[PDB]
Amino acid sequence: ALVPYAQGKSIHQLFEEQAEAFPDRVAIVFENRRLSYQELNRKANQLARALLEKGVQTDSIVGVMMEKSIENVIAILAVLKAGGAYVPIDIEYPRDRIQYILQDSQTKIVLTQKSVSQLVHDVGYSGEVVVLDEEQLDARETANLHQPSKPTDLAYVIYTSGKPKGTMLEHKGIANLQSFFQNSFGVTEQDRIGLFASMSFDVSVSEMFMALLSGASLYILSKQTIHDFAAFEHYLSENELTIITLPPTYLTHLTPERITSLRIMITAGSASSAPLVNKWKDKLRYINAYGPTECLVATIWEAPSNQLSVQSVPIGKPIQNTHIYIVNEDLQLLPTGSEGELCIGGVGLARGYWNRPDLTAEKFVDNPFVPGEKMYRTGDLAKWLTDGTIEFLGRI
Numbered sequence: 063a064l065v066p067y068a069q070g071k072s073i074h075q076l077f078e079e080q081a082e083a084f085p086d087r088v089a090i091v092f093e094n095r096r097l098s099y100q101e102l103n104r105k106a107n108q109l110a111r112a113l114l115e116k117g118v119q120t121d122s123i124v125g126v127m128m129e130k131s132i133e134n135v136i137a138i139l140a141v142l143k144a145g146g147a148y149v150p151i152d153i154e155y156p157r158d159r160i161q162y163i164l165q166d167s168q169t170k171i172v173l174t175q176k177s178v179s180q181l182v183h184d185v186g187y188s189g190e191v192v193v194l195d196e197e198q199l200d201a202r203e204t205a206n207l208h209q210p211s212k213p214t215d216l217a218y219v220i221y222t223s224g225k226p227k228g229t230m231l232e233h234k235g236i237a238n239l240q241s242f243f244q245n246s247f248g249v250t251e252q253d254r255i256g257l258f259a260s261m262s263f264d265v266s267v268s269e270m271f272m273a274l275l276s277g278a279s280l281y282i283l284s285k286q287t288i289h290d291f292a293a294f295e296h297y298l299s300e301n302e303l304t305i306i307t308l309p310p311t312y313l314t315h316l317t318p319e320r321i322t323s324l325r326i327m328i329t330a331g332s333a334s335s336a337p338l339v340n341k342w343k344d345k346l347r348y349i350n351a352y353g354p355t356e357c358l359v360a361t362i363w364e365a366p367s368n369q370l371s372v373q374s375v376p377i378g379k380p381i382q383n384t385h386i387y388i389v390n391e392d393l394q395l396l397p398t399g400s401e402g403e404l405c406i407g408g409v410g411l412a413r414g415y416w417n418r419p420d421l422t423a424e425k426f427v428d429n430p431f432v433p434g435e436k437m438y439r440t441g442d443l444a445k446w447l448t449d450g451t452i453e454f455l456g457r458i
């Protein structure tokens with residue numbers, strides 16, 4: 063790779079390495095409960111062995127219908143360790159949408175919990191249902207499994223909206239992001255990282271593995287904490303959280319003077335205004351992160367430090383091992399200042415859309431610039447600036 067990363071390693075392999083180096087460090091926090099890296103890893107291994115016994119294997123797609131919680135993360139890690147990929151199904155989606163995802167994904171096994179069992183019943187799911195807080199796992203072996211794995215194996219299928227489509231992401235993209243987070247944000251095991259997004263929104267993937275592939279601690283925010291801006295600020299300050307990713311629409315309601323310990327604020331998913339950036343960029347490192355679900359994150363713009371106010375907010379430059387092409391309708395490259403479609407190549411590109419071969423071929427085209435690879439057509443309008451940053455301009 064152009065930029066070094068842990069090539070050849072799976073997500074759970076990278077997590078296991080952190081658990082070996084930082085066994086007694088806090089890995090995950092939810093309300094009054096927490097687990098160390100060693101405890102989290104052992105519990106994930108016990109559940110992974112149960113999942114293997116039930117038949118989970120390479121490119122098994124496993125539904126997860128759970129409340130955000132420590133146990134939710136145990137389940138994700140266990141699916142990966144068993145060799146499968148997870149499909150997160152937010153339990154607050156409407157019943158019609160849950161049923162569509164279950165049917166489209168063709169998953170034969172759904173991981174849930176006692177408080178969600180009735181919803182699994184009421185959506186009519188006829189596959190295998192594992193109620194995790196009814197399974198007896200404590201007696202199972204806790205060592206790592208070392209199942210066969212390749213970086214090109216599926217890691218997760220996340221649905222977006224035509225009809226919702228299951229976007230298929232492999233391990234390699236997240237391995238590259240481990241290296242990106244450590245190089246570009248300087249993430250270390252000392253960091254304390256909040257988890258804000260729904261597990262059905264791929265921001266949550268970034269947040270979870272930003273912590274757990276670096277030895278840092280992951281603080282899963284409760285619904286009560288998110289629902290009250292003052293409670294959110296108090297939680298971040300009392301727990302001395304150092305990194306958080308937010309929608310700009312949430313950030314606009316927060317008070318910088320009430321957050322004590324953040325060193326990085328990332329916004330993602332929509333544009334931040336220049337006045338919002340100006341309000342935060344001198345209190346901490348403000349980062350605008352852009353990307354489609356089809357590659358998680360594609361570009362970032364960190365507001366340059368110790369500079370006067372900005373009047374606009376670029377989406378920045380491609381992250382490591384990722385390439386941006388701004389092209390016309392004939393996929394020809396445009397010069398600086400010309401508006402065109404933002405297209406993406408790189409190690410984090412999705413495999414495509416689950417059981418949508420024509421749509422996949424339409425959106426993941428042959429990369430004209432790198433023979434043998436694919437390039438994703440985002441439908442986003444953009445242009446280059448002469449300083450080499452990109453301006454997001456809306457939809458084509």
Ligand SMILES: C#CCOc1ccc([C@@H](N)CC(=O)NS(=O)(=O)OC[C@H]2O[C@@H](n3cnc4c(N)ncnc43)[C@H](O)[C@@H]2O)cc1
Nearest residue numbers: 264265268330331332333351352353354355358359442454
């Ligand atoms: C470090 C770190 C993690 O960083 C990220 C960054 C982006 C993502 C996205 N995958 C989140 C997202 O919104 N995905 S989405 O599929 O629901 O929507 C993608 C579209 O949203 C818009 N978008 C998306 N980020 C922007 C933007 N920063 N400005 C302005 N429009 C945007 C563009 O239209 C994208 O094509 C996740 C993690």
